[PDB]
Swiss-Prot record:
It is linked to Dystonia 3, torsion, X-linked: An X-linked dystonia-parkinsonism disorder. Dystonia is defined by the presence of sustained involuntary muscle contractions, often leading to abnormal postures. DYT3 is characterized by severe progressive torsion dystonia followed by parkinsonism. It has a well-defined pathology of extensive neuronal loss and mosaic gliosis in the striatum (caudate nucleus and putamen) which appears to resemble that in Huntington disease. The Bromo domain mediates interaction with histones that have acetylated lysine residues at specific positions. The second domain also recognizes and binds histones that are butyrylated and crotonylated. The chain holds residues 1522 to 1650 of 1893 of the full protein. Residues 1-107 form the Bromo domain. Belongs to the TAF1 family. The TFIID basal transcription factor complex plays a major role in the initiation of RNA polymerase II (Pol II)-dependent transcription. TFIID recognizes and binds promoters with or without a TATA box via its subunit TBP, a TATA-box-binding protein, and promotes assembly of the pre-initiation complex (PIC). The TFIID complex consists of TBP and TBP-associated factors (TAFs), including TAF1, TAF2, TAF3, TAF4, TAF5, TAF6, TAF7, TAF8, TAF9, TAF10, TAF11, TAF12 and TAF13. TAF1 is the largest component and core scaffold of the TFIID complex, involved in nucleating complex assembly. This is Transcription initiation factor TFIID subunit 1.
């Protein structure tokens, strides 16, 4: 299971060191509390936040960049929907998304390596089954 452990480790470091460090990103750190935003869950059908991404990483939900990026992109998509394309929340979520893509890009070689090797371990597991 250890290429998956290393992979999750890296994703988690992206979330804490890059995405959470975006200025004024605090609104995206945790699930919305309906007390503070009364309509959020009536408008937003698939909520997402950085704490949920971190909890998903620690459970090894993400085997590849694609499923990680799907949740990351969801944060920006919910913000366009709820706040509008030019809201300050959306600009902050766009920086969160943009710095995530950039970091994945800078780690592209090692991350392709890990992704391929998580798969090859998945297959060895099947050639047991
Ligand atoms: C899951 C993240 C969603 C991002 N988001 C958060 C808040 C917001 C504002 C103030 C407090 C909270 C909140 O519930 N906290 C900090 C727990 C969320 C907000 C207010 C208007 N639009 C938004 C918004 O798009």
């Amino acid at each position: 299971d250890d290429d998956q452990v290393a992979f999750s480790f890296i994703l988690d470091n992206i979330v804490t060191q890059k995405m959470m460090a975006v200025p004024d990103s605090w609104p995206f750190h945790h699930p919305v509390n309906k007390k503070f935003v009364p309509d959020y869950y009536k408008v937003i059908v698939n909520p997402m936040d950085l704490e949920t991404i971190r909890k998903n990483i620690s459970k090894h939900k993400y085997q590849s960049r694609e499923s990680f990026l799907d949740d990351v992109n969801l944060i920006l998509a919910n913000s366009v929907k709820y706040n509008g394309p030019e809201s300050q929340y959306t600009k902050t979520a766009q920086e969160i998304v943009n710095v995530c893509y950039q970091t994945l890009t800078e780690y592209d070689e090692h991350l392709t390596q890990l992704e391929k090797d998580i798969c090859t371990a998945k297959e060895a597991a099947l050639e047991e089954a």
